Amino acid sequence: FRVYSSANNCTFEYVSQPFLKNLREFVFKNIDG
Amino acid sequence: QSVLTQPPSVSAAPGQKVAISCSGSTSNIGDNFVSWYQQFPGTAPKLLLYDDARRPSGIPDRFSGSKSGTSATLGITGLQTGDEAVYFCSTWDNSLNVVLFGGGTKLTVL
C-alpha cells in the first residue's frame, strides 16, 4: 500500500467489512453534506 | 537517586550463552517493566525486547531472557561477528518519576 497517499491530517474515519466472473456495482451520491 | 547497574563490558566465544545483568532496586526494577536496546556503532539504538520477555518482530531469538527480583538479565546465543554492540536496559521509576537508563555493556566476538 501507501502508493496513493503522501501526507494528511484526518477528520473522519470509518472501517468495516469488505465491500465485496463477477459484476460489482455502486452508486455514489453526495447530497446535503 | 538509584541508578541501573549493567556490567561495564562482556566478552564471550561464539555459541555460548552470554548474561548481561542490569541491577537496580525496588523502585526501578522491583516494581515495573524493563526493556532492552541494541546499538551498533554510528547507529540510532533500536528495540530488542519489552515486557521483560517479549520481542519486537525481527528481535534475535538467540538474545532473550527474563529475571526477577531487583535485577534483570539478557541471555544471548549464536553470537555472530555482527552481534557486537552496546545493550541498554531501560526502566521507569515510580518514586522519583524519571525514566532511568543503563550504563551500557559492549559485546565482543572473540
Place this chain on the structure above:
Amino acid sequence: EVQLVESGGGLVQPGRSLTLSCGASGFTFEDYAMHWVRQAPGKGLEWVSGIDWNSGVIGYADSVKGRFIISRDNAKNSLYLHMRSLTAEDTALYYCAKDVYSESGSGSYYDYWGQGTLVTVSS
C-alpha cells in the same frame, strides 16, 4: 515508514540558548507521547525530557531542570526543546525518541528513534 527528522544542531557558544526541533512522518502524531534522549560521545544514554499527547510535560532530568523547555504542536507535527543557558557538559547527540503509549511512565518501551543531531558547546 516512521522517519523522525531533527534540526537545530550546530556549534553553540557556552552561554547561548538553542532550539532543537524534531519532526515526524507516516504515523499519527497526537496519539503518541514523544521524548528527547541525549547521548554524550563515548557514553550511554541520558534521558532529557518527555511529553504526552496533551503536551503535558513529564519532567526533566535532574541536571537539566529549569533550563530545558519541551513543547510540541500536533498540527505542525513537531516536538521542540528550547535549551536555555547551555554549558560544557550539554554537548551530545539528541535522538528524538518515541513511546508506544500516550501516558509515558507505566514502564514504557521507546520504539522508533531518529538519527539524531549533534550539539557541541565549545569556544
